Structure formats: structure tokens, C-alpha cells
Amino acid sequence: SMYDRHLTIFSPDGNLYQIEYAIKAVKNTNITSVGVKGENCAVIISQKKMATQYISQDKLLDYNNITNIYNITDEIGCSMVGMPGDCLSMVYKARSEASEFLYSNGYNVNAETLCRNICDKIQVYTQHAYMRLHACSGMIIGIDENNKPELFKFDPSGFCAGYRACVIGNKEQESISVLERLLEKRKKKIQQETIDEDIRNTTILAIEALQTILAFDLKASEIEVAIVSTKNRNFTQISEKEIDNYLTYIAER
Amino acid sequence: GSIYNYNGGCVLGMSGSNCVAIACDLRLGANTFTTVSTKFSKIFKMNNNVYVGLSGLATDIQTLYEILRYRVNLYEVRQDAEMDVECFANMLSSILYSNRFSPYFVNPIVVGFKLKHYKVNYEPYLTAYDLIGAKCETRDFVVNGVTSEQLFGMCESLYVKDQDENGLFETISQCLLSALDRDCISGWGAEVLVLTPEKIIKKKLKARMD
Amino acid sequence: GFKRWYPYIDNGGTVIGLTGKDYVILAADTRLSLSYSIYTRFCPKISKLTDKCIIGSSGMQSDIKTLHSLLQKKIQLFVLEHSHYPDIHVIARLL
Amino acid sequence: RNLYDTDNIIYSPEGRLYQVEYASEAIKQGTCAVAIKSKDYVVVSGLKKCISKLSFPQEKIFKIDDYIGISMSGITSDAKVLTKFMQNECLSHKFLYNENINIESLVRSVADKYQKNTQKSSKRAFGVGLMIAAYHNEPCIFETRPNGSYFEYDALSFGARSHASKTYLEKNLHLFEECSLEELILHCLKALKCSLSSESELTISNTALAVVGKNHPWQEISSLQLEEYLSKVKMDAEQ
Amino acid sequence: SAGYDLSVSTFSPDGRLYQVEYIYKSINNNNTALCLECKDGIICCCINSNMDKNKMIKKNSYNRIYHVNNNIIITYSGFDGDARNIIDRARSEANTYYYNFHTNIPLHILVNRISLYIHAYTLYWHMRPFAASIIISSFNEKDKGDIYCIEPNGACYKYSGIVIGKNKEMFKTEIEKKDYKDINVRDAIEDIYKFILTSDDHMNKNNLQNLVNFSWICKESSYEFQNIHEEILTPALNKAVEYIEKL
Amino acid sequence: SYDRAITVFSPDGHLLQVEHALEAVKKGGCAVAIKSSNFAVLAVEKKNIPKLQNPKTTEKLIKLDEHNCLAFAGLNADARVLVNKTRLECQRYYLNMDEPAPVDYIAKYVAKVQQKFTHRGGVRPFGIATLIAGFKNNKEICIYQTEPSGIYAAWKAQAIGKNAKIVQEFLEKNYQENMEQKDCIFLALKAIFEVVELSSKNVEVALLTEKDLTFIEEQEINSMVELIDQERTKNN
Amino acid sequence: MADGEYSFSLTTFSPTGKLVQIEYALNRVSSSSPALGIRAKNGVIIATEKKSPNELIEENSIFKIQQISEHIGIVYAGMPGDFRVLLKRARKEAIRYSLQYGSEILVKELVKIIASIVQEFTQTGGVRPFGLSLLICGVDVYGYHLYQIDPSGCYFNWMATCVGKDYQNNMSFLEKRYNKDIEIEDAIHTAILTLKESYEGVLNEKNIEIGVAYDNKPFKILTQNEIKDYLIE
Amino acid sequence: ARRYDSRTTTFSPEGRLYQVEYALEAINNASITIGLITKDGVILGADKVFISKLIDKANNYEKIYKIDKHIFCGVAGLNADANILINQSRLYAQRYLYNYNEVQPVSQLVVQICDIKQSYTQYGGLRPYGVSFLIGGYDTKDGYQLYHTDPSGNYSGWFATAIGTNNLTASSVLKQEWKNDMTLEEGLLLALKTLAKSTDTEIPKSEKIELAYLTNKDGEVYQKYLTEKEIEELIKLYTQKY
Amino acid sequence: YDRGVNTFSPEGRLFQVEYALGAIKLGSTAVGICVNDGVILASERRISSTLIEKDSVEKLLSIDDHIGCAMSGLMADARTLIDYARVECNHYKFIYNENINIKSCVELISELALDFSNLSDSKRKKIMSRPFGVALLIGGVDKNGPCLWYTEPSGTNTRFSAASIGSAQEGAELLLQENYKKDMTFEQAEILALTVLRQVMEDKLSTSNVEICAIKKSDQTFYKYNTDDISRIIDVLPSPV
User: Fold this and answer.
1) In this complex, is the C-beta atom of H176 within 8 Å of any C-beta atom belonging to chain F?
2) Torsions phi, psi of I83, nearest 5?
3) Which residues form the signal peptide (chain B) (predicted)?
4) Residue E246 counted as domain residue
């Protein structure tokens, strides 16, 4: 009919254009996040940037409060890119899902299952006409029960998957090429890494990838970096000073 | 327990070689001592390979039998096959437990054949229940009802493994009759059904009527 | 264990009425008691319902207060909805 | 076509709610009412619409509570629902707390009742405005709008051709504070007359007038006193 | 538009939600509200210039500044009814937090809860989204000032000073000149009056008294909500007015 | 649960859904009821494919309870649901009063149901008109006619369904009071055949008395049809 | 919302009698990565094409072949979120049956229950149909079964079938070389050959998933190495 | 959201219900289903729609279904809607047995399912069921019975009838050939004839035919769903007799 | 149609209410006259044919012993409203042990009529999905003496000394305005009612096409007029010139 592009109903070719438009709304925020997996750790790096929305950025804005990385639990964090209302909503949904899991089962949910349950929630928006889609794409990291890092990413269509490395943002084909090159370059070494060396290499790869993608010089104050490892399984950000040191090392090489 | 003495009655299951038998008394009591009927069968055919014996409160017997018939008929029309006796036994357990806190005052037994398709092999199947659906799978015999102790004594003493249909009939009938003769609130006739894969033999025993 | 709490208590007191041809007298004592002790010596038992109608009650003081106030509320609502004050007989049926 | 005025939950490209604005438009079609207040009194005066020669004039002002009364303009049934709500809120407050309700809280509750009817597609806004006059530690006049907003006034008027009454009130606003109850009544009635149709006149039949003040519970004026006031108004209009 | 702007639950083909943008336009057309962090407190001011032709309104009776627990300032620009709804919800969340935990709800948690409440009215095809943006702010000795502004889309950001509503751009241009973290709230009062005189052409020195709401949470008020007394607003108003008439 | 207002006022001031239901009724078969001193005759057109359709199944002349019967025109399925509601109400009345429901009570109930279905969100009106013959509490025989709008009246004789105006006008100039059972039956047959093909298999006829509802035999109908054919040929 | 006046059918009849939303869901399926199943003499195989978009994704994170219970497997062609919802519902129904009757759910019973669930979404108010087709394979007392479930809720009993893209040509290729008396190895080879004839280029153990239920054994999903062995020849 | 409502249960300017007319068009677009009553039982026959040679043609009847021991139906229209209503009618028969301790009369079952269909046409805002049923059965009250239902909740009894595509030809054949006292064999041969003539051919094909009948013999009702072999034998007999 | 039932027009009027107003202009004409001695209601009955039983159809219904009602517009809707009014009046009588004031009955009826607006969920929930499209004349005698009230689909209630409804509303109102007088006695009220009805009736006035009821102040009892009373009024009527 004349409204097949308004509701979550199939169009003549089989498409649900509302899902496509929600994904485009995510893309319109102009925010880029990158997640990278190590051998015993995982990193997420995002821009500390307000999503391009109706309002603009003021010089009285508190830029430390601007973030796209959240803790779901002590050991599980994420990046949520998209409309900030929707991103906060998805953060709260994920937190409540994790807490309910913990109470019901007596052990913390791992990142994969939390991502899949979130996507089960999103599918309901994709099938019921009276609910708007959440214009939100996310990356979730954690350390699973076998001390292996996890990197999972969901998008408004309810589709999720695990990744060796991923990017949310405007361009994602060229981002995938950059990440593939960085991963193969890292993999071609045969020396065994220490836990600390592995974490350092992973963080440097994440920073260098975000930089080669965004195509400008990252300032430590304008980006955020969060890590989870087998040394420290808590999802923790790193200081602006450590980000700056990683950046000085990257530039001088 | 007094509720179970209101009507009286008992049921007994026994297996032989490629045969199985189910028997019950025929009395409908009232107020524990008044006999109001002498043709109140406690044995019900679910399908050709599944029988159930329901002792206890007569209203609950009829109600549970109707529920079980409803469930079996729906299952078999949906599946286009006869319900396996084990599935039926588990279903009966689940139905009884679903009323765990206001239960049906019934003491069921299930008797039939477990079919194991290679021809087909017919393995006797026996199960006794309590009113909330606890199950006792057995190979020799099962009992239930206010006459349970007497039936247990008679079966423990007289049951013989791997009897043919005639031996099975004589044994189960003797067990039932001896047990009934010691009960004030059970008896007034006995029906005995002897099952084989080919035929069902229904007998009414010339029993005591006091 | 704990015994089930009883929701009734008699706070005592008397109400007396007497009609005349063109008048009515309603009198009530003002003691408020609990078992064998006196809560207060001044607890009026008569409430005004209309210019021509009052109510006096004995029993549980919380119940009496709630009922008098409910009746006053209902009567003011009646006055607003129906433009006239209810007669004593109307109030009697309503009570 | 508008394409944005069909449903009450839809904003137009200019950020307007057209259904709510139409509900407000219903208010301008009602008969005129005027409320003014001195340091001790609030006087409410309004015109009672007459359908035909054989018909009795419609009621314009209503008692809510001992010291609260209202006048309305717009859809009468809406006003009746709101009147019942206010009367019940006041009586329930007296029943529960043994005190006269706070007028601000009552008007806020009324405005929230207004607001809840604008958020769902299965509702419509109340198509009526309420002018609320009370004395609670001071005289007060409030207005409530279909959009869920309310305002306090020193003098107020609405209804068909209420701009003339508003002109009169703006002119003399400085006087009302210090004038006596008789003078305040004359002012309110003259402001109401300023909204009259050319051929029309203020009569005991078609004129509603209420006073409420410090020791003066809400009370409509009787036909005799109202007639004396109307005669005084005519006489000092001739001047 | 193109038929994609009739519902808050339909994305446009370019990925935009038009009902939300129309609400933004409504808010930007409405009266001005601002909150400013100073050295020893935060100061909030609402300019009700839309009511300049409403001569009969009771003097100083329309106030857009409320508070939550006597220590959080909450104001708005947009529909009064929707704002009252959101403020009722804020107070209800504060009550529930106190009931559960016996301590006052932290400002940032309350902001998150309010923003989620607002965002929930943008999700369904049968509910009107709120037409209001909210400022929520507090101040205490150890933490200095915290100012959050919640958008109708449900996005909450943190500011050192915020202006919403009409003429906000010029007000921001004026606010950004001085670092008010080193100025006291009392001194900021005169600056704010000067900004009002310059930026809102509906406002003159005649209606500045009855058209502006002033409140603060500062050391002088023991870090609890208070409307600024007229005996403080009067000299500041007079001085701003004479300074402006000079140039 | 669906709650949209299906029946609404058109600018002209009409309930168009009710008028469309009336159209459905006018697409139904004809039914005639005639009243007498203490009996009523009801007749209804029959449509049945010869030798393939079963005539005994379809029932347009049905018994509500001991003393009340109903004929209807319009949508069959709507009629079945309404008739079952009416039987239920008959028995509920008996339970709550210890007396069978009078005819007027049942007519009022049926009309109330139809009106209600013009005035509730998420439902369309019944596309049926009904003739209800029965006894009042004074044992008097009455006939009521209800319509999709919910309006009812009592009649000495009435036709509903397709071509009801021709039958009505015919009945006006041919109906007498206190007619005998045979003459009332003949009048009903003439009225129905004024607008339906002449045949025994095209009409079902029943007679209502204090005792029970009795359908007229096939042979009696055929004999009366031969009488009608004779009078028609002789009149031409 | 869900309830109230806002619960009306989004799938309705057209003048010709067609329910176009179901047709559009069918098109969506016909544009999806191919899947197929084969019923052999002593087992049933379901195979699918799992083409990794990029070398960054983890293949194990994507499994288009899932187990519903012991002896029952499922694969889909179409939208993956819909598949997740229906797979969770199928597992729930399997355990509900097991709790009632103790034993494992018969394949036909599961298929009928899931088909009814699918059908509901073509008639209930305020929803779209599911955009996928399911192949359900399993072994029970009554033999080996291979069932398909369409977006409309119709179910079919198959000796062998293919859903998704190029499924007419795939079915021609599969009926050219299917007999009722194949073995498990022959069936797996045939499934692989069909998926090769459909897929453009070169297949490998990462481009396809395979699940088997044979010789009255529990359903198992072939590992990468087992499939590589099947691909050596 | 009212702009998306298609108003399924709303009268049309001619007192028509458009969704019901379209559902009937869909049913008319389905394969032929026939039924007829002999003195030996009710026969239901149907043409199978070809999809592929790989469909499993063993014990797979998709147009004729058992509702109870004494009731069975033929389907014309959307198969999934039919599956829903068939499940419902099996439930209804078993509920009647539970409540009354005797098997449900056929007309009561038909009435219950037709009530479901009518309700969907009158209440709510959902589309109607797109299915016609040929319900046949036996009960002591009315003997052998055969009924036809349509989406509107209507039904009617028949001695022989056909639904689905080209029902006109099949109905004419039945009207010419059906007799008031036929034997089961004669009934089955006539069913084969009308199926062959409606499918535009002369010798029917076993692979495309579903045939079942329902007999009350020796006091119990028994349903036979003819296999491909039995249908092949009947096809040979038909080609002999014609 | 395109709109919803609760939509305002740009002039602040509910479309459905306005359309419902166009339905009350239809039906038989009725006239109410309220004088000091009582209130009289008179209506013409539009018998469709000789086969219809006159007893069955009636346009003057009694709501309580002391209240009668004439109706116009959709008769099924009018009957719904009247039944509701009967129940409510008797509930009032039960809980207060007195006759309900007429104005209170009119208020109850008007609120029931407007229930479709869904304005508030207090007490029962919304059930009616549209206005009633009925105009009523409700006369009765209460403690304030006789009174005549008019209610219409918009929910406005107006009190009259004399009024008219139905197709001939306007002509009847013109005749009433120029002839009604306050001090009119009861017999003159009856004469005026039947004169107006005959003047505006398409048919010729007679005992079978006119129904009358009155609620006299003497006894506050609704009374229906049989053939003798109508015959007397007709035979005391003036000339038709």
C-alpha cells in the first residue's frame, strides 16, 4: 500500500524500510566506535563527541560528561552509537536484563548471551507496528567463563554477531579493510606476548585503527578507551594521560 | 483417608508372558457401609494398549476418567496414532500433580503394553500412582485402593513370573478374591480383564456379595 | 504466636432524644473512655448535618467520626447536585 | 488541506497542536464573563444565554465550595464534568483533612486533568475555559485553558466579544484594588455591559452575579439587589 | 515531510524523526530559561516575554522555576502542562528513591530517569511526545554546580551554563564572554539583567520586574532552593538599566 | 481489543452502517407473519438446489422457547448468533422470574441487542430484520418486527426481506381479523407468492398456537398452491 | 498500542483473494541465502550456505543450523531475528511437551505447533508475518522427517527440498539426483553439490553449515574438519 | 494509527463485507473438494495441488482431515487458516464429549466452527478465515450428514456438493449422476468421475487424488483414507466402467 | 470516515455532535406546555399503515410516576436513554426515599448522552461509541412545581415554559411563542397544545393520531389520555381558519 515505508511491514520486494531508515539514523550521528579483540583482552574506543542532532555543541558544554561507553555490569561494558535517547534506553534495557539474569541464575551473564537477549528484545520492535525502532547500534565486550574475550555487535535490525574487530560509524567497508590490515599485521608475528604486552598491543591497535579510519589526529581528550582483560576483568576506562601516552607512541614510530 | 472409605473399592494389575491383566471390585459404596451399586467398574479403556484402573472417590474417578479421555482423544487425533502407554502414564502423573494442593482423591493404576516396533514386540507395562502423581513402575504387579495391604500380601505370596494367560487369570482372580474377602467396604463382584496383543478377555467372577 | 487483632472497641457514652410537637431534643455526654480509663472528658457525640438535622452516635469513636464526616460530605454533595437541602427523612434513608 | 489538524497527538511543522487550538476556539464562542477583585472581595459577573423567547436563561456561574465558585465559557458538558471534579476534590479534602482545600492545589489538579486529555489519540481536550474565583487568605482569580495551562489574574474576561470588557478592565485596573464592594460590583457589571450587543441590555433574567470575600462565602446576588445595581449602572451610564 | 512527519514512530527515508524536530521548533519559539554556574552557587532565570501584552496577569504570579527536594532546581521552556507532568514525575522518582534508600536521589540518576520517561513518549504511534526541554541543576560546597538539560528526544547533556527557548543564541553569546565560575551569584544578577535587556527586544526596564523569575541555590541560601528576594533584585535591575541607558 | 467506532453519523445525520445493514436485509428472502384471534401464521421463502441441497437443514422459521417463534431476513450467520442470544435470554428470564418470557419482552430484548450493536466500538450491526410471534402475559397473540437500527413495532401482519413493500401493500387490502387457520394460511401463501415463484418447495409455512409450533405439511401447501394457480389463471 | 482500537489486521485480503503481505514475506525468503534438506534411508541432513561478509566476523557466532531438542534440528532462510524468536519458541514447546509426556516431542507435533504460531502472525492485529522459511528435520519412533514451514503457516512434508535464493534451479538439481534409498554420505555429498551449483565461485568448510540426524542418533552439527573431509573428494 | 486500519468488519454501501467476498474469491481459487452421501457412508474427495515430485506422498493427506471418530472434513482455501479451525473443531468435539459423555452431533460441531468464523466477521478488526469446509459425519440423530461452510460463518446441508475451483462442472456432474441410494463403490466411482471432469481430463491420476470415506458398520463409525494403491485400483475400475 | 469521533472542527465544534444535531430534526412533532397547574405533553403519531398496532408505538413515555418524556430523532437511541433514566430515577428514589427533581433526571440523561466523549474514567468506563442523536422533552412535577426541560445531543439542557421538537419544530414554536401565557390555566394549555399540533400536523387532528399526557401539580402523577379526554379537547377546539 501507500504506507509500506511507514510501518514495519514488508514492501513488494520484501524489505522493511523502517529498519533501513533506523540504521541510516544511526549512521547520521557521525559517531565512530571501534572494538578489537586480543588473546586475553578486548578494547573499545569511541569518540567523546555529541551525536549530530538538532542541537549543536556549545562551549559551555561539559565535554567530560560526553560519552558513548557505558558499564552494563562490573565486567561487561559497551559502546552505544545512535540517537542518545535510544542509546540510554538500550543501556538501561541491557542493565536490567543482566541484573535479572544474575538473580535468576546465580551467576553473571556473559557478553554473547546478553547481546542475544537484547536482540530478542529488538526483534519485537521490528515485528510490532505500534512501536518505533530504536536507532541504536552497539558493541559489547567481556571475558567469558573460559577466560576468553568476547566482542559482539548489534544493530537496529536485531542482528548480532561476534567479531575479531568491528566498527560502528559512517563508513564501514573502508573501516573493515583497515581493521583487516591491522589484524593480519599483528597476527604475522610469532613471538608469544605477555598479558601486559597483549593489552598494550590491543589498545595501540584500537587507537591506530580509529585514527586511520577518522583520518585526522586524535586528541586524548576527545576519545574514550575502555578495556577488559584477564588481568583485570572489570570493564574500566583508561585515563586521558594513558591515552595520550599511547598516542605519542603511535605518532613516534 | 475417611474420604477413601466413603466409597471403597480397589484395583489390581498383573503381567504374564505376552499378557497383562487388570482387575477391580464392582461395588459403589456410600457412607462407608451402604452398597448402592454392584456394577460400578473401576477399569477404563483409553486405547487398545492402555487401560487405567481408578479407585477412590467415585466423583473423582468419573471426573479424572473424563479428563484423561479428553486428553488421549485430542493427542491421538492430532498425532494420528495410538498414544504410547508410557506417554500416557507420564501425562496422568502430570495431571494429578497439577492439582497438587487440592488433589483428586484417586488411587490410579495403569496397565497395558509398551510396543517396541522392530513385527512388533508387546512388553507388559504396569504403574501405580498416588493422588499427587508419584509413580511406581513395576514388572510383576501393582495395587491401589483401600484393599491395598491385602492385595500386597496376596501378590507377594502368590505371584508367579512369566505365566500364560490362563495362569495369569487364575492368579490375579485368586489374589483379588482373597484380598476382598477381608475388606468390609470392597467387593460385591469382580471384573477381570486379561490382555493379549490379539484379544481381550473380559470375565465377571462369582464372588461374595456381603 | 500472635493473636488476631480485634478491630472494635466501645468508647462508651450515651445519646438521648426526645421529640415534641414542634421541637426535638438530642443530648449526649462528652466522656471518651477506653476500657476503665478516660481518654478525654470532652469528645462531643453530636454533629450538625443541616440547619434542621443533627446526628448523635455512641460506639467506636473512630467509626463515629468517619461516619459523621461521610454523611456531611454526602449531604453537601447532594446540596450541590440537587439544589436543595435534604429533609430528615431523606437523610434517614441515606444513613 | 491541513494534514496536521486531524488528530490531537500530531505537531504541525510550526510546532502547533491544532486540535487543542480548536478546543480553545470553542471558548471564544461562549457568553461573556468578567471577574475582578479588590483587596477583600472577588466579584464574578456573566451573561446568561437565552435560546428563545419561551426558554429560561442558561446558568453561567456555579458554586464549587463555600468560598470557591466558577464561571465557564465553551462546551457546557465539559464544564459540568470539571465542575463535578472540583466539587468532589473540595469535599474529599474537607472529609480527609478537616480543612478547606488550598486553591492553588485545586487549580493545579484541574489543569492536570486538562493536560492528561491532550496526550493520547483516543482523547480530546476539554473544549471549555474555567474562570475560578475564591478567597483563601486573599481574593484570587484563576483561568484554566484547554492546553493544560492556568494563570492567576487581577481582572479577567473571556467569551464572545470580551475584548470590549477587557478594554474596560485594563482602563480601570488601578481603581479596583481600593474600591468598596458596591463599587466593585458596579465596575464588574459595567465591564460586562461593555461586551453587550447593540440592541441588548443587562436584566435580572440574563445577568449572573456572585460575590465572595473575606467573611462573605460565595453567594449569588438576589433579584432585588441585582435590580438596584443594574438601575444604578444605567443611571451613572446616562451621567 | 513527504508523509513521513505525521507520526513520532515513523523514521523518514533520510533517517530523521520529524515530529521531534517540530517539537524542537515549538520549544525554540517559547519563553527563555537559563541556568548559570557561579563561584558560590547556581543561578536560574526565566524570562516570560510572551506575556508582555497580558497586562491583567497578577504581578509575578507566573513562575517556571520549581524544585525537587529543596536542593534541586528544575525549570523548562515549552508547554506548561507537559512540564508540570515531567516535574510531577521527577518528584515522584525522588519520593520513591527516598522510600527505597533513605537518601536523596542523586542529580545524575534523577536526570537519567527523567530523560527515559520523556523518551518513552517518542516510541508509540498513539502518544503525543512532550513539547518541553528541561533544565535540572544543583549545587553544593564540595561538588560546585551541576547543570543538566534534557531534550524532548530524551538526550541529557551536562553544561556549565545553558540557555533554552527563544533568543537563546544571543543569550549564549553574552554568557560565554565571562568565566562565571570565578564570579559570585550576586554579581551575576546584574549581568543577567543586562543580557535580558540586550537580547529580548520585548523586554524593557518597565516590565523587567514582573516578567522575570529568579532563583538560586548558593552559599547564602545554605545550598537550598530559594527565590531571590526583591531587595536583592532591585539594585541589580536599576544598575543594569542605568548602565544600558548610558550606552 | 478493537474499539474503533464503526457506526458513526454522516454529515447528513445518518448512521450509514445501519442503512447498509438495511440493504443486506433487503437482499434476504421474504418472510410474512399474519396474526389472528389466538394464532399466527408465519411463512418464509425457501431456496434450495434440487436433489443436491438438503431442505431440512436450513431453518429460517425457528422456535425460541415454549411459546415464541421467530422468522428473519438478511444475513444467515448474523441471524444464527442473534437467535442463540435470544434463546439464552428466554431461559435466563424463566430462571429469574419463574415464568416463561412474554413475546413483547423478547422483542424488546432483540431490539436492544441490535441497537447496542449500532452503538459499541469495534462491532458492526446485525444485517437482519426479524418477525417475532408469541404470546403476551395476558395470553394475547402478538407479532413484533425488529430491524438493524433497533426499532420495533407490533403488527397485525407484516412482511420483511426482499420485496417487502409489495407484500405489505397486498396484506393491507386482504387481511381481516379473527380469520380461521386455513384462511390465514391461504392468505400467507398468497402474500409470499406475490413476490416469489409459485411452488410448494419455495416456501415453508408454520402455524403458532398456545400448544406448539406446527409446520404445514407438503401436501397441504401443494394443494393451496394449485388453488392459487387456478385463481391466477381464472383472473387473467 | 498493542491493545485497544490500535489492534487491527495488517494482512488483509485483496480483490483477487491474495494476502499480499504473505507474498512479500515469501519474496524476502526467496532473496535469502539458500538452505536445503535431504531425507536419506537412515537419516536426514539439513545444510545451509553461511557466507561470511568479512574476515572480521566470527563464524561460530553465526550458526544458521540449530538444535531444538535431541534428534531435532532446524535451519532457516530469511530474517535472522525472526528465526531467533521462533527457535526460542520451538525449544520452549519441546520442553513443554516433554514435561507433559516425559519423552521427546514428535516431529509432527512440533511442526504443527510452530506452524500455528507462524499463522497467528498473519491474522492477529498490529503485526507483520514472519519473514522466513524453516526446515525442520528429526527422527522419532515414526521414522525420519523433513518438514518446511512457510511464512503463511503452511507446512509441507518433503523427501528433499531447498529454500532461499535460486531454489527452483536448486530443486531441479536436487530432484535430478535424489532417490529414496540414498545413504548418509551420499546425501551429504548431494547437499554439498547442490549448494555448490547454487553458490557462485568456490565453497569451503566456512561457507556452509551441515546438520545430521541418522541411525537413530542425536542431532549433530558437522564440524569444520568433518565437512572439509566431505569436501576433499 | 487509524489511517492504517483497513476496516475489515465494516459494511459496504451495498450491505456487502468486502473481506468476506475476497476470502470467497480465494476459496474459489483453491483446488476442487467434493463430497457426497451414499447409503454406505459419506465420501470426500479432493484434487492434490502439485508442488514437486519430492513431496512425501505417503500417509500425507493435506485436504481431508479427521475431526473426531465420526466426523471428518475437506478443506478448500488457505491451508493454515484451515489448520487453525480444524484444531478448534477437534477441541470442540472433545469438549462436547467431556461435558455430555456422548459424541457430538455433526450439526452442533458445524455450528460451533461457523460461529467462530462469523465472530471474526462481526467483532474485532481482523481479517476473516479464508477457508470453506466440507464437513461430513455420522450420528444416530441424523444419520449420515454432509455440510458446507464459507468464510461468512454460513453453512448448509447437502446430499452432494463441491467447493473450490471449477465447482460448477463437478456440481453439474453430481446433479446428473448422484442417486438417492448408492453403494460405497458407486459413490467412489462417481467421486472419481467428478474429480476427473473438474480437473479437465478423462482418466484421473492417482498421484493427484485424495479419497476418504466414513462408514457406520456393525454399530461403530470407521474412517478409511484410501492410499495410492486403493485409488489406483478404483481408477482401473473407473476406466473399465467408462 | 477519515476523522475520529472526538475531532474538533476549526470553529471549535465536535463534528459528530453537529451531525447528530441534524438527526433530531426528524420524526413526529411533539409539543410541551408547562403552566402553573401542570405540564402537558402532546405528540403526533405517524402510523405507517393500518397493519401496525397503535398500542405498540408511542412517543410519550413515563420515566417515573412524576416524570414524562416526549422524544424525537432515532427512536432506538431515545429508548436507550429513557431506560437509563428510569433506572437512575428509581435508584435515586431507593437511596433517598423521595422523587428525583426533574432537572437532576435531565442532568443524568445529558451525561449519559455525552459519554462517548471519553472525557473521564470516573465511575463506569466509556461504552457508547457515538452521540445518541436524540432530542427529548422531559416534563414533570417536583417540589419546585411543574417544569419542562429540553435536552439534545450536544448535552445542553434548557428549561422552557413551552417547547416543540420533531419535523415541525419551527412552525410549532412560532405558534407557541405568540399564544403562550404564564397565567394560563390547564384547559387552555390543552387547547393550545392540540391547536398547535393540528395546525402543524400533515394529517387532520383526531383521537387516533394524537397522544397526550399530563403531570398535574395536584397529584404529581403522570397520566396518559384515553379517547374520551382527547375527544373532549378536540370538541372544545377552535375553528381551523
Assistant:
1) no
2) -60, -45
3) none
4) no
Q: Is A30 exposed, middle or buried (0-12, 13-18, 19+ CB in 10 A)?
A: middle
Give the three-class secondary structure for F133.
Answer: strand
> What span, in angstroms and rounded, lies between the C-alpha atoms of I24 and F14?
10
Say how many CB pairs under 8 Å bridge D and E: 97
What is the number of domains present in chain E?
A: 1
Cα gap A216→A211, rounded to integer Å: 6
CA distance A18 to A128: 12
**Domains present along chain F, CATH in parentheses:** 16-232 (3.60.20.10)
Q: How far is D113 from chain C (nearest CA, A)?
A: 21
Which of I64, I52, I138 has its CA nearest to residue I94?
A: I64
Which domains, and CATH codes, for chain H?
2-240 (3.60.20.10)
Exposed/middle/buried for residue F61 (C-beta within 10 Å: 0-12, 13-18, 19+): buried
Quote the strand ranges of C1-95, DSSP E: 15-19, 24-28, 32-34, 37-40, 46-50, 53-56
Residue G113 CA to chain centroid, in angstroms?
Answer: 15
| Neighbouring chains to E with at least 3 Cβ pairs closer than 8 Å | A, D, G, H
What is the Cα Rg of chain B in Å? 16
CA nearest H135: which of H164, H110, H117, H116? Answer: H110
State the resolution, in angstroms.
2.2
- Locate the chain I residue with the closest alpha carbon to D127: I12
Q: Which three cell numbers stand for residue B155?
A: 501378590
Number of domains in chain G: 1
CA-nearest of D232, D239, D175 to D209 is D232
Question: What is the distance between the alpha carbons of residues B161 and H21, in angstroms, rounded to a whole number?
Answer: 69
Q: Tell me the C-alpha distance between A68 and G111, whole Å.
A: 44
Burial of F48 (0-12, 13-18, 19+ CB in 10 A): middle
DSSP SS3 for G72: strand
D171 close to I (CB below 8 A)? no
Rounded to a whole number of angstroms, the distance from the CA of F133 to the nearest CA of chain H is: 25
Domain with residues A1-251, CATH architecture: 4-Layer Sandwich (3.60)
Chain H neighbors of A3, CB-CB under 8 A: 3-4
> How many domains in chain I?
1
Contact flag for F and H (3+ C-beta pairs < 8 Å): yes
Whole-angstrom Cα distance, residue E181 to residue F173? 102
Alpha-carbon distances of A211 from A64, A184, A207, E18, E113, rounded to whole Å: 20, 18, 6, 34, 35
Q: Is A1 helix (H, G, I), strand (E, B) or coil?
A: coil
- Cell digits for H86? 480444524
The cell for B29 is: 459404596
Beta-carbon count within 10 A of D182 CB: 11
Residues 6+ apart with CB under 8 A from F143: F33, F34, F35, F40, F131, F132, F133, F154, F155, F156, F157, F158
Which technique? Answer: cryo-EM
Give the closest residue to B129 by CA, choosing from B164, B89, B156. B89
Asked if E155 and A135 come within 8 Å (Cβ–Cβ), the reply is: no
- Domain membership flag for residue I200: yes
Q: How far is CA D1 from the centre of its chain?
A: 35
Copy the grid coordinates of residue F196. Answer: 416469489
Domain topology for B9-206:
Glutamine Phosphoribosylpyrophosphate, subunit 1, domain 1 (3.60.20)
Burial B150-163 (b: 16+ CB within 10 A, else e): bbeebbeeebeeeb
CB D125 within 8 A of CB D111: no
Nearest Cα to Cα of residue I93 among A246, A12, C89, E240: C89
What value, to the nearest 5°, has the Cα angle with vertex G176 and ends G175 and G178? 55
Is residue B88 within 8 Å of B48, Cβ to Cβ?
Answer: no
Distance set, CA B27 to CA B10, B106, B169, B177 (Å): 9, 16, 21, 13
Contact between G136 and G111 under an 8 Å Cβ cutoff? The reply is: yes
How many residues are present in chain A?
A: 253
